[PDB]
Ligand binder design. Structure first.
Ligand SMILES: [Zn+2]
Lengths: 73, 58
């Protein structure tokens, strides 16, 4: 399925993912497209920072959901 | 009974009383408010990383 990951700086990343994907997995995917390392990434959906060991389905992230990416410094 | 937006179609219990089309409109509305809210939060959190970095190198 597709989900979109918006940055604050004018970019939307489209990812190919499964409800079963871990957050760690999704961040690996962002490293693939964007060259950003997983540990520089904070992902947000529905008011919450997403945890590395949980899956998209744990958050009811469905087809076409939009997450936000913030950079960790 | 009938759709709560007053559509003239029947609403579905599994969709809070709404019909297929009216429920898709509510769903879209909710998902826009969620994206706005997450944007606001991602601003807060970005402000905060830049500050935490800045006081770290100050
Ligand atoms: Zn209706």
């Amino acid at each position: 399925m597709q989900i979109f990951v918006k940055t604050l700086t004018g970019k939307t990343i489209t990812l190919e993912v499964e409800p079963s994907d871990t957050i760690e997995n999704v961040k690996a995917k962002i490293q693939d497209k964007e060259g950003i390392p997983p540990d520089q990434q904070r992902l947000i959906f529905a008011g919450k920072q997403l945890e590395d060991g949980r899956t998209l389905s744990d958050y009811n992230i469905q087809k076409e959901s939009t997450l936000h990416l913030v950079l960790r410094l | 009974l009938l759709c709560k937006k007053g559509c003239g179609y029947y609403g579905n219990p599994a969709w809070q009383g709404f019909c297929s089309k009216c429920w898709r409109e509510e769903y879209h509305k909710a998902r826009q408010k969620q994206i706005q809210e997450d944007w606001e939060l991602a601003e807060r959190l970005q402000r905060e990383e830049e500050e935490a970095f800045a006081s770290s190198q100050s």
